[PDB]
Amino acid sequence: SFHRVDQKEITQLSHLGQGTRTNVYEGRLRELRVVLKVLDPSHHDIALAFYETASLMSQVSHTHLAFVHGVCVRGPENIMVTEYVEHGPLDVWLRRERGHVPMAWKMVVAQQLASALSYLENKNLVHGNVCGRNILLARLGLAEGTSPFIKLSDPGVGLGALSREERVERIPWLAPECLPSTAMDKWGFGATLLEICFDGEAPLQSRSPSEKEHFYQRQHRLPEPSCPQLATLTSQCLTYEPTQRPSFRTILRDLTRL
Ligand SMILES: CNc1nc2[nH]c(-c3cccc(CNC(=O)COC)n3)cc2c2c1ncn2C
């Protein structure tokens, strides 16, 4: 279930970048500034995983979740119309501001992200693509006495429809059980906290596919974060056994208790 957008209602503007089986553009709806996620020419199983994401995102509402306006489906074209968030992806921003992002700023982002994921967990919904690229900055929190404001974006094509090579490319955000899950987002959240702590440089992100697969096969563990208040929590989320990961209710409480 999602809103159908007619092709006449959307205008495509400049290219923002590439996603998994997609090209992202700034656009106009009706006029409202939006983002257009244009799926590549695809088989039906890929387009169905794109529809499942649009349906998931159309049935949720949370202050830290990005809005989905609908989907344009006509012949070979599939375009998801999503919320344009003022300052774009968190990973890109963190890399530009490297060395100048305070610890307190990172803690706020962590709590907002846990609140969005606690909301999804309570509705028994899995995101499957938690990473810095999918976290959007609505407010920067740069001025004295202000705080950042993030929105978790849609997960794009569902993990279940991707190739093994594409899953390997998602290491370290990919939960290890997904390599060959109501707990996969806890691992994705933990790897995103490391990515945030390291100013947008996630561990392993540069390693070759075979090096990434060996790390998981041997159950080597990711580094401790540079934020000392997040070390216990990241270690608990980044456990190979899925049943040992804490719930987002616990994660969100553990963050408020710091
Ligand atoms: C400003 N608002 C938004 N910007 C976005 N950029 C991307 C995006 C996606 C893939 C690769 C890149 C990297 N490209 C650059 O660094 C060059 O910059 C143009 N960027 C998605 C996205 C977005 C926004 N609001 C909602 N969403 C989903």
- The phi, psi pair for 65, rounded to 5°, reads -120, 135
Q: What is the rounded CA–CA span in Å between residue 35 and residue 101?
A: 27
77-83 and 32-39 beta bridge pairing: antiparallel
Q: Give the integer Cα–Cα distance in Å for 63 and 136.
A: 12
Q: Residue 169 burial by CB count (10 A; 0-12/13-18/19+): exposed, middle or buried? A: middle
Atom of ligand 1 nearest to the CA of 16: 19
Structural contact between residues 183 and 242, judged by C-beta atoms closer than 8 angstroms: yes
Residues near ligand 1 (Cβ within 6 A)? 16-19, 24, 35, 82, 84-85, 88-89, 92, 136, 153
**Fold entry, domain 1-84:** Phosphorylase Kinase; domain 1 (3.30.200)
The radius of gyration computed from the CA coordinates of the chain, to the nearest angstrom, equals 18
Print burial letters for 47-79: b (CB count within 10 Å at least 16), e (below 16): bebbbbbbebbbebebebbbbbbbbbbeeeebb
Q: For the chain, which residues make up each domain, given as ranges?
A: 1-84, 85-258
The residue whose CB lies within 8 Å of the most ligand 1 atoms, and thus the one to mutate among 15, 16, 26, 80, is 16
Hey, whose CA ends up nearest to atom 3 of ligand 1? 88
Topology adopted by domain 85-258? Transferase(Phosphotransferase); domain 1 (1.10.510)
Q: Which amino acid is at 211?
A: E
Q: Is 235 exposed, middle or buried (0-12, 13-18, 19+ CB in 10 A)?
A: middle
Determination technique for this entry = X-ray
Cβ-contact 123, 129 below 8 angstroms: no
Does the fold of domain 85-258 match that of domain 1-84?
no
Instruction: Dump the DSSP string for 1-24.
Output: ---B--GGGEEEEEEEEEETTEEE
CA 257–ligand 1 middle distance (angstroms): 34
Amino acid at 232: T
Question: 208 is written with which tokens?
Answer: 């070759």
DSSP-derived letter for residue 89 is B
